[PDB]
Symmetry: D2
Subunit: 125 residues, 4 copies
């Protein structure tokens, strides 16, 4: 099994009130669902990603990332977000991320296609 | 099938000489392998991601993203990159992306954990 | 005078313990000094930037940005950070930012030249 | 004088057709005007920034950054862009940047306040 397979697997909540439900595989796979509290989103969306299944043992976090394309049976926002970050274990376990949200645009509007931000996920709230 | 399922599936090359091999599923799945020409990388790494399988029909690109965790049997760089971007079809087809590369760090070094950049992928070179 | 000239001018502190001392001009100028609690930095560095001197009156924040090149008489880290964000007034006044920190690199290493992060500045601590 | 004071000072053009006119001071100051070919912009805007006036001599680029707040006598877009990058000298001299464009928003919309992109500036076109 992956070192933080147990630590990562489960339900996570960010500062916006969004819900991230993920299963970490022994090989490095992340699969689950994402529900955003904001934006052009309704209900759950598929996510997939990857994590470092053999992280450093020096107190460093565990690198990971995942993607959601914002299409499900209720809604299509013609966009995708990727979160890139690290898992930090312990009593106050966290996933600290930065994200890039790209919308489909014409070539003329591609300069304004991509939003950037940061989400912190915790096991409570 | 997804609108750009055929357009996205295949081999792509970026400005650094890296090779992105991807299969787009009808549902929105991206699976494949990534080989970086630079950095702490050797040979192929698993990737997974998502794309908008029903994009707009107004000339807009197709939003997508994917993740690579930089661990395989040869090397572990304790890091993950996510690419967020859009596919643009046509004779000069492209995937234009921005990326976030997070390394596992201690809490003290988390401020310097994340690199940002941009890759443009084409079907040739 | 600028709408938030009074609100912006002064001393600000971020989550890392860094100190941002700024004067906002009536025209949109930002001038001052920055002292980082982390990284390849010692003592104060010159900063300059700009802010929207006539922001919206709908409860929106006030857009602004500034730059520090990390050279002073004590130290040169061959790098520059830009912070881009907005000022939010009130009892819990804040400047919420995202930043890009570019280091001078060879062309071969340019892909790994730029760090990204986020700082929140407040009037206390 | 700064090592690349002469190299940086002048007129630069990016891939969008925007015009960046800058004077580099011996101390590290950047002052000038910016004219964007795209977005909510008309004519010239004030810019200010900083550069490393004593860069490395190992073939590395010269770190720099600057800010434009998008208010002038013609237009106010309640936003600011910061460019962070490096100057690379030679026959094909370039300023390679990444940028963050923050708009003033309500707290509810702050998650979608910031665009990210990349501009490459050259002395011709």
């Amino acid at each position: 099994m992956g070192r933080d397979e147990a630590g990562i697997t489960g339900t996570w909540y960010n500062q916006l009130g969004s819900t991230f439900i993920v299963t970490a595989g022994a090989d490095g796979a992340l699969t689950g669902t994402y529900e955003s509290a904001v934006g052009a989103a309704e209900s759950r969306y598929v996510l997939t990603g990857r994590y470092d299944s053999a992280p450093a043992t020096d107190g460093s976090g565990t690198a990971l990332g995942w993607t959601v394309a914002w299409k499900n049976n209720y809604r299509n926002a013609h966009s995708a977000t990727t979160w890139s970050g690290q898992y930090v274990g312990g009593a106050e376990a966290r996933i600290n991320t930065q994200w890039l949200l790209t919308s489909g645009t014409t070539e003329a509007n591609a300069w304004k296609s991509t939003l950037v931000g940061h989400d912190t996920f915790t096991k409570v709230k």
